[PDB]
Amino acid sequence: APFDVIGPPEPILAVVGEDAELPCRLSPNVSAKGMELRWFREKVSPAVFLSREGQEQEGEEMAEYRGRVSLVEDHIAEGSVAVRIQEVKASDDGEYRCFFRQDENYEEAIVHLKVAALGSDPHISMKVQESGEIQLECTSVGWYPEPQVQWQTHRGEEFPSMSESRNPDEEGLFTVRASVIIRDSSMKNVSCAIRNLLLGQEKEVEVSIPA
């Protein structure tokens, strides 16, 4: 083929409920107007998005993409386009392939969509049980992907959970539970941080321990 198709340097990061754009471009930077533009996941057909002869082909698109996909083409005349996916969900996470065809010449590349959701303000439950020992449970809802839990003393010394749980909701978002047993007098405050590693964003909650 007298052209190549280049995908992005890195994964595209997309927040749940927002739109994402999956770009691919021709090399050299020649017009892509009128080419077959196909985005797909596992099977070439049915596709995430299909344009032929400058028209979207809806009947050749997966039913779960129909009506939420569209071609971004501000820059099509120089070979640069994208598929906009509206209202991103957790199931949209993964590898996509972008295929460009003019008659007998075709080429393709890979775009990675990485989906993220940031969950609720964490909460700590305190329960004093068996003689002086304190059990804390930290809870938060709605993270994607699996979020990280970090416990810290007021000084900043991290320590691990005793146990942890993650359970996806109906839309695939994780609820996280983590428990720790505090064995100390001198622990003034303890905090729990829940972090989405993909966004590099966290939330925390501090609690206060009685003598």
Record the resolution, in angstroms: 2.3
Pairing of strands 12-15, 105-116: parallel
In angstroms, the CA 209 to CA 14 distance is 39
Closest alpha carbon to 46 in 33, 64, 19: 64
Q: Which class does domain 118-211 fall in?
A: mainly beta
The CATH number, out of the four listed (3.30.930.10, 2.30.30.140, 2.60.120.10, 2.60.40.10), of the domain defined by the range 1-117: 2.60.40.10
In angstroms, the CA 65 to CA 46 distance is 10
Beta-carbon contacts of 72 under 8 Å, excluding residues fewer than 6 positions away, are: 21, 23, 81, 82, 83, 84
∠ CA 145-173-162, nearest 5°, is: 70
Structure tokens at 16: 């749940």
The reply to whether 1-117 and 118-211 are identical in fold is: yes
Contact 77, 31 (CB under 8 A): yes
Contact 119, 16 (CB under 8 A): no
Phi, psi dihedral angles at 180 (to 5 degrees): -140, 150
Domain edges within the chain: 1-117, 118-211
Phi, psi dihedral angles at 78 (to 5 degrees): -110, 10
